[PDB]
Ligand binder design. Structure first.
Ligand SMILES: Nc1ccc(Sc2ccccn2)nc1
Lengths: 237, 300
């Protein structure tokens, strides 16, 4: 059924699986019209599809043109996500298709289930984990490509950089979710932590800085401080 | 008017005929039911005094033969049988009426309830849902499962209702996934009506038969089917106007006839609230909504 703290290590076994996050698919700015009414203006979005074992991220950019002339866009967005995921699975060789797709929001279950009827053997699952993938647009290189796009486009990224050379998928995913949780809780502080030292650079082919093992420990500790901190500044503790 | 005689009543049993019922005591001089209206299907049903488990019964149409009931002490139930010796049958029936050992089908003359519950139900279709072609009548009981319930185990003893599944390739056209899931009109009008049922009368006939099996036998799979067939209509933006009008009349009499005390188990909160207050047809079922709100406002 659902994915949670009890069956967490299943993400790192050798059954191919994908997380899908649709949070950033339909994005808007709300503003006042000359007549003083309110209106929305859509901006580009993205589907966040990640294989947690390898770090392979299929970033499908959703150009605002897809909304033109459409109604009930928040509902459409869930179906559009499912259509694009389904198209992705169909484009993969059979031996690369996932055995499970895990959706981060329960509202994607029916849209994905219906678009995947052709694949009765791919399990569509929810999760009780509160994953921070919405913060993916706080990763500068991902936000950049999304906002620059002039048409629909699939960008391919390894969200773990080269970490798997040195650590396991379980640890790499833990690092990733800690970073994204921190970016989600206080983006400024989080980004300050990551970039404060100008001698540690992000490689052109990477998303995150080239920290050594020791430096990642320091960084990881500082992000935990941050998340505890904002948890006091928010709950006055 | 026609008659279903009983050889005898060796065990205490509550007998139903359509929406009527009466108690027969162990070895009471009971020889059957008379004055049964010709022109309608009927159901005669049983619940033993000892083992209220297993309600069971027989759908029949008196125009299709002379039928009687006889207890089987080996199998332990009241069995329906057909008498082929037409002469023998009228002789038997006449003797039991002269001795007045029969109960009279107790139809009030103002009362169209049974007609309204069975308007579209036809023996021929019942026999296709309940497969046992050597008998002109059909046995149903509480425990019989449906073909869809078996996909989810004795195929000879099943209710072969039409399978409806909203997340199925039959229900969903490629390229219309969102359209067809949110608005079921394609599935209702093209796949089911035109494709399978052929007309709305056969559709309504299965719907009413499903309801009746749920109410008389507490048959869970029949209840599931009745709600599915309502939900398919209620969730279709485009339904012929006469069908909606008739559906409102069908459902009205079903809700009217339901035992007040069985509503908690026979009525699906989600389907009804969806159909009456959210679906495309939320404003189309005026009679049904009024009787539901006055009789089962807790459910809503
Ligand atoms: N920079 C980079 C680009 C592509 C790849 S390969 C790949 C294939 C499919 C999905 C994700 N990554 N690995 C690293």
């Amino acid at each position: 059924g659902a994915m949670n703290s009890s069956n967490y290590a299943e993400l790192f076994n050798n059954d191919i699986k994908l997380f899908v996050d649709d949070t950033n698919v339909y994005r808007v700015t709300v503003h006042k019209t000359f007549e003083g009414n309110v209106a929305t203006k859509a901006i580009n979005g993205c589907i966040f599809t990640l294989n947690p074992k390898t770090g392979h991220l299929f970033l499908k950019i959703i150009h605002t043109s897809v909304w033109a002339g459409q109604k009930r866009l928040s509902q459409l967005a869930k179906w559009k996500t499912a259509e694009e995921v389904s198209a992705l699975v169909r484009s993969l060789p059979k031996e690369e298709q996932p055995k499970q797709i895990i959706v981060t929001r329960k509202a994607m279950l029916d849209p994905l289930e219906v678009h995947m009827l052709d694949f009765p053997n791919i399990a569509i699952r929810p999760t009780e984990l509160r994953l921070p993938f919405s913060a993916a647009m706080s990763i500068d290189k991902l936000s950049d490509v999304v906002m620059k796009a002039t048409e629909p486009q699939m960008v391919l990224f390894n969200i773990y950089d080269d970490w798997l050379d040195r650590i396991s998928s379980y640890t790499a995913f833990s690092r990733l979710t800690l970073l994204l949780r921190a970016l989600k809780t206080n983006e400024e502080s989080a980004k300050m932590i990551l970039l404060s030292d100008p001698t540690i650079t992000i490689k052109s082919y990477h998303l995150w800085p080239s920290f050594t093992d020791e430096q990642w420990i320091t960084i990881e500790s500082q992000m935990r401080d941050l998340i505890l901190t904002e948890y006091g500044r928010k709950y006055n503790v | 008017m026609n008659t279903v005689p009983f050889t005898s009543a060796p065990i205490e049993v509550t007998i139903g005929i359509d929406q009527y019922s009466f108690n027969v005591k162990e070895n009471q001089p009971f020889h059957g039911i008379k004055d049964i209206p010709i022109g309608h299907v009927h159901v005669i049903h049983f619940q033993h005094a000892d083992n209220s488990s297993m309600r069971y019964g027989y759908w029949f149409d008196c125009r299709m033969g002379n039928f009687y009931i006889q207890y089987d002490p080996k199998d332990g139930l009241y069995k329906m049988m057909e008498e082929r010796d037409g002469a023998k049958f009228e002789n038997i029936v006449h003797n039991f009426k002269e001795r007045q050992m029969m109960v009279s089908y107790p139809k009030i003359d103002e009362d169209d309830t049974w007609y309204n519950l069975t308007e579209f139900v036809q023996m021929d279709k019942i026999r296709k849902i309940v497969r046992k072609d050597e008998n002109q009548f059909s046995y149903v009981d509480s425990s019989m499962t449906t073909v869809q319930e078996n996909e989810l185990s004795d195929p000879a003893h099943s209710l072969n209702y039409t399978v409806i599944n909203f997340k199925s390739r039959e229900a969903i056209r490629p390229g219309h996934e969102m359209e067809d899931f949110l608005d079921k009109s394609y599935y209702l009008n093209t796949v089911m009506l035109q494709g399978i049922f052929k007309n709305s009368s056969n559709y309504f006939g299965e719907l009413q038969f499903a309801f009746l099996n749920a109410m008389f036998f507490g048959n869970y799979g029949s209840s599931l089917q009745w709600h599915a067939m309502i939900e398919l209509i209620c969730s279709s933006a485009t339904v012929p106007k006469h069908m909606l009008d008739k559906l409102d009349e069908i459902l009205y009499y079903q809700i009217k006839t339901l035992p007040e005390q069985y509503s908690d188990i026979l009525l699906n909160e989600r389907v009804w609230n969806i159909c009456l207050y959210s679906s495309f047809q939320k404003n189309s079922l005026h009679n049904t909504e009024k009787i539901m709100e006055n009789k089962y406002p807790e459910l809503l």
